[PDB]
Each structure stands twice: as structure tokens, then as C-alpha cells.
Design an enzyme around this catalytic site. Sequence first.
Site, PDB file in Angstrom:
ATOM      1  N   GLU A  35       0.880  -1.130   0.119  1.00  0.00           N
ATOM      2  CA  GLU A  35      -0.034  -0.101  -0.014  1.00  0.00           C
ATOM      3  C   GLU A  35       0.787   1.100   0.004  1.00  0.00           C
ATOM      4  OE1 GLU A  35      -3.142   0.357  -0.559  1.00  0.00           O
ATOM      5  OE2 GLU A  35      -3.963  -1.564  -0.345  1.00  0.00           O
ATOM      6  N   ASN A  46      -7.713   9.391  -6.033  1.00  0.00           N
ATOM      7  CA  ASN A  46      -8.827   8.309  -6.573  1.00  0.00           C
ATOM      8  C   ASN A  46      -9.283   9.033  -7.607  1.00  0.00           C
ATOM      9  OD1 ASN A  46      -7.836   6.094  -4.998  1.00  0.00           O
ATOM     10  ND2 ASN A  46      -9.237   6.851  -3.417  1.00  0.00           N
ATOM     11  N   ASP A  48     -12.387   9.362  -8.351  1.00  0.00           N
ATOM     12  CA  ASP A  48     -13.577   9.951  -7.854  1.00  0.00           C
ATOM     13  C   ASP A  48     -13.613  11.217  -6.916  1.00  0.00           C
ATOM     14  OD1 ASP A  48     -12.661   8.944  -5.650  1.00  0.00           O
ATOM     15  OD2 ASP A  48     -14.367   7.815  -5.022  1.00  0.00           O
ATOM     16  N   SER A  50     -11.902  11.608  -4.033  1.00  0.00           N
ATOM     17  CA  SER A  50     -11.489  10.881  -2.766  1.00  0.00           C
ATOM     18  C   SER A  50      -9.819  10.891  -2.782  1.00  0.00           C
ATOM     19  CB  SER A  50     -11.966   9.725  -2.149  1.00  0.00           C
ATOM     20  OG  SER A  50     -11.756   8.598  -2.949  1.00  0.00           O
ATOM     21  N   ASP A  52      -6.518   8.586  -0.652  1.00  0.00           N
ATOM     22  CA  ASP A  52      -5.807   7.437   0.148  1.00  0.00           C
ATOM     23  C   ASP A  52      -4.696   8.035   1.249  1.00  0.00           C
ATOM     24  OD1 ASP A  52      -7.844   5.951  -1.061  1.00  0.00           O
ATOM     25  OD2 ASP A  52      -6.246   4.554  -2.040  1.00  0.00           O
ATOM     26  N   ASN A  59      -9.045   6.320   3.690  1.00  0.00           N
ATOM     27  CA  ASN A  59      -9.710   6.451   2.145  1.00  0.00           C
ATOM     28  C   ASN A  59     -10.639   7.376   2.767  1.00  0.00           C
ATOM     29  OD1 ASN A  59     -11.608   7.354  -0.237  1.00  0.00           O
ATOM     30  ND2 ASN A  59     -11.441   5.337  -1.064  1.00  0.00           N
ATOM     31  N   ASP A 101     -16.005  -4.577   9.146  1.00  0.00           N
ATOM     32  CA  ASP A 101     -17.138  -3.978   8.553  1.00  0.00           C
ATOM     33  C   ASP A 101     -17.914  -4.891   7.633  1.00  0.00           C
ATOM     34  OD1 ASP A 101     -16.156  -4.134   5.858  1.00  0.00           O
ATOM     35  OD2 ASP A 101     -15.836  -1.786   5.921  1.00  0.00           O
TER      36      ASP A 101
END
EC number: 3.2.1.17
Length: 128
Positions: A35, A46, A48, A50, A52, A59, A101
Site C-alpha cells: 500500500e 483516486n 472519484d 477521494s 488514500d 480512504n 465492517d
Amino acid sequence: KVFGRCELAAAMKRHGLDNYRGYSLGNWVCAAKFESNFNTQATNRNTDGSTDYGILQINSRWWCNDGRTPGSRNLCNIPCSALLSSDITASVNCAKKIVSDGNGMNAWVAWRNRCKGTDVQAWIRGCR
Ligand SMILES: C[C@@H](O)CN1CCN(CC(=O)O)CCN(CC(=O)O)CCN(CC(=O)O)CC1
Ligand SMILES: C[C@@H](O)CN1CCN(CC(=O)O)CCN(CC(=O)O)CCN(CC(=O)O)CC1
Ligand SMILES: [Cl-]
Ligand SMILES: [Cl-]
Ligand SMILES: [Cl-]
Ligand SMILES: [Gd]
Ligand code: NA
């Protein structure tokens, strides 16, 4: 901060990550390597809009507030900037909620494609 392999394993083990939701310590060090390359200060935009953040690339869409991801959630209740610290406490507590989650460690695309189904114990091999 750029962590050594043994150094990061001892810090993740001290913050309770070892066997958290049945995921051995090797899965977590492996994920961090692919990562962030063990760098707390890593960021990736990203498509969209957003971003990281930090050693496990958490995120801004769902998990933290960067003030530039419109109509996003802050389910860890932290500024994203807290996930870049030399202290991995915020990153670890935030990751505990993500892996809990429903989708487990599949939330981390690099874990799924490069660690899942491999000899993950190799990543803590030789560490005290
Ligand atoms: C511990 C030593 O291995 C240090 N090391 C010596 C050189 N190595 C030789 C080898 O690893 O067999 C080859 C290069 N190496 C490839 C790899 O690691 O897979 C990338 C750089 N490494 C990264 C790392 O090791 O964490 C640091 C330097
Ligand atoms: C050339 C060697 O470095 C061969 N090496 C296999 C043996 N390594 C060596 C070591 O790092 O001591 C121990 C396990 N290793 C831990 C880690 O590197 O963080 C993960 C697998 N690596 C991934 C990579 O290097 O990118 C495969 C290449
Ligand atoms: Cl392991
Ligand atoms: Cl925002
Ligand atoms: Cl699971
Ligand atoms: Gd290696
Ligand atoms: Na957010």
C-alpha cells in the site's frame, strides 16, 4: 517516517493488530509494504476525487475528513492528516473498524492481489 519491517511488526503487535479478526501479523505487514512502501506520509488521489492516506492508505470517501471530498463520511472521526503521523495509533484504530465492517482485508486491493493465498509469515520471519 519510513518504517523497517521488524520495527513496523513490533508496533502493530503492540497496538493489538496480531490475529485481529483472525488475520495473522504477516497479513498486516504485507498490506503496508504494497500500500505505502512502509511510509506513513504516502498519499494517492483516486479518480472519484477521494484520497488514500498513510501506511494502510485509508480512504477519505468513508473513513476520515480532508475537507475536499464532498458528501463523504468521517466514520473514524479524525482529520486525514492524523493518518500521516510517525505514530501509527490513529491508522491502527481506524483499520480495526474497516476490517470489522463485513469485507475483512479485501478492503485493501494490494492485500487481495499480492498477499492473500501467499506465505504471509515470511514478512515477520527473523524478527524478535
Ligand atoms: C536485507 C538486504 O536484502 C538489504 N538489501 C540488499 C540487496 N538485496 C539483496 C537481497 O535481498 O537478496 C537486493 C535488492 N533488494 C531486493 C529485495 O529485497 O527483494 C531491494 C533493496 N533491499 C530491500 C530490502 O531488503 O528490504 C535493500 C538492500
Ligand atoms: C531477494 C530477497 O529479498 C528475496 N525475497 C524473498 C525473501 N525475502 C528476503 C528478505 O527481505 O529477507 C524475505 C520475505 N520478504 C520480506 C520483505 O522483503 O519485506 C517478502 C517477499 N519478497 C518480496 C520483495 O522483496 O519485495 C520476495 C523476495
Ligand atoms: Cl504471519
Ligand atoms: Cl470533505
Ligand atoms: Cl474475514
Ligand atoms: Gd524479500
Ligand atoms: Na470524508
